[PDB]
Fold Homocitrate synthase, mitochondrial.
Amino acid sequence: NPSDFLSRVNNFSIIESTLREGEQFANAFFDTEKKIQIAKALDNFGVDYIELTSPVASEQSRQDCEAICKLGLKCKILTHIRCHMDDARVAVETGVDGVDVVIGTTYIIDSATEVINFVKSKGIEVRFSSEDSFRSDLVDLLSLYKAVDKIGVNRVGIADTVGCATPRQVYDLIRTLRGVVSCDIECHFHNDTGMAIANAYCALEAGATHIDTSILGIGERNGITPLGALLARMYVTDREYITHKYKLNQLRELENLVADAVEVQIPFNNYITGMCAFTHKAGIHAKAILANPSTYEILKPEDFGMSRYVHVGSRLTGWNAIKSRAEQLNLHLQAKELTVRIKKLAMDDVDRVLREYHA
Amino acid sequence: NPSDFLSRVNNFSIIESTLREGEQFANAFFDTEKKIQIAKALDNFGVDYIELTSPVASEQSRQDCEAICKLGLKCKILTHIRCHMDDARVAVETGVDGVDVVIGTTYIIDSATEVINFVKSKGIEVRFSSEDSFRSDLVDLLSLYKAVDKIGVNRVGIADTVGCATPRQVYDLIRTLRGVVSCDIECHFHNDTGMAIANAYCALEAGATHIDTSILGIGERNGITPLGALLARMYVTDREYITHKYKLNQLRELENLVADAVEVQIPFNNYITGMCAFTHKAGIHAKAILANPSTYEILKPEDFGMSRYVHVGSRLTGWNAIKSRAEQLNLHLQAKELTVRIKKLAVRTLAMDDVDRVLREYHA
Ligand SMILES: [Co+2]
Ligand SMILES: [Co+2]
Ligand SMILES: [Mg+2]
Ligand SMILES: [Mg+2]
């Protein structure tokens, strides 16, 4: 199939947006110190880019943008702006590697031209994006990308800001964009209807080169493509590429860092790192399928820093529950006041209570 | 455009599988009474079918199947079996409306013929399904469905048992199957790689007629297409169809019933009913986008029994947190009992997802 030649499923970059999209999470109020811990951990994890809330947003955003650019991280630091010269002047002086010029759908082209050429004159990477791309007029959108491509820009951006796009619709649009522009393509997908990971997958199949993620998917409403969930999907597609590019065994600690800051639990069903992600039912309930449960193990626990699937025969209560999960997570334990805590206190409590501990 | 004629996005049936797939959830140990509560609530909610664990699985499974069939529910009660006569004999006597004959990939066709014709001779709906369909040889699978279609079955089934299938691969396969068989098509998608909802969507676009779900997605590993998530997606596609077919304002109670039984929290990010599903960030963080946050409201709270999006400007702590969520949920508050159990959680440091947890005991 000729179209497989364009697929970027084993050759793409993550733009990690916990410090942009994630700031829109209902309970996210990151201070400078926490953002710095997150940026460092994300860099250690191996993402190519980190995106930050516009330095125009507030005085604290300008300062944090500047501080993060002074860290000497390996990943590139990106931010975004409105299509406006004053915004651009602020962004360029902050030390960022890249600026996204964002519009929402003539006088757009001439204004965008000024902004784009200014940023390029500073030696800074420039991108041009549309907001709510899937509820915009398609021909006007494509004509705008076409013109901006001729001006010369590093990347164009597509965003399903509303969460309404479906996978085949995403594939078709990105595949057309790939034929319209000569540059890289960044994508952003909201998860309101459960499509955020699928939409990311199909975008990559269609030739997109950069995907926005967020740790635990946190963001506006129910958020965007989750970091861990994208990697699980991409890992099944190309195990060797993903296992060697990212430090997958650091994913639990990365999520725990964010979950503590935004005061949430890790959901039981959470991709890879949820309580139940690496579990099989043993016993009479397993006869709801024909093959032995261990036939169905698309994810290998050891690739993600864990030791086994847990085969559940009966309800795990007390220190039996704690011990089983602790051993699956390769925690070496301390064991005293965990079973003493759990008794004076549910299933997701097991992970809650174990959050402190490292493998 | 001609392909749109085959699409079932606004004309499909849900096969609710909380009482089959859901039993494979690591922490699910439903007794007869709990299964009966779940079956009744599912029927009231408006699903067309519920599927139960094979009555062959154990003595109690046989008994619960019988008991659920005696309830007089409106939805049809389905179960599944191995491609074996003894299984079929047991299943038919239970009172079920439908039996799924499941195989995993010439003697298949002979055995399957006997079992299919037996079930049909009892006046019971028969379906024929493959397990792990997306890791099977395509030509053999399609040839098998073709043969079973000629014998005559009510439905054929496709299952991504391993969670590896991708949306376009699903579309392509279902669309081929739709041209191979003349009967209805039931689907089943695991969520290991985050595709279970997308896969259901594309299956329906391609002509599938029946989709398995489970409440909160619960099942083997991280489970299958979640009931609420499918309905959110299908609601955006056709609001009038979904809001009138299902009792969407009952979804929280339905999930709360299962969450209590399998002892989990409702995830903060859960579709529709999660803490944060109907929230916008107000303040300087909203400038991470161009438009007012209220521009992006694909889901309308009132359709799901809720009162508004919560616009968060600052950390909602204490009674402010409780009041905000309680009013969003349309609970009419009892604030002296909810003051008496957070004083008992001083036991530990209290955090965001506990708001929904302490509010579970309350109805709209
Ligand atoms: Co967004
Ligand atoms: Co299954
Ligand atoms: Mg972007
Ligand atoms: Mg089925």
Observations:
- Residues 265-359 of chain A form one domain.
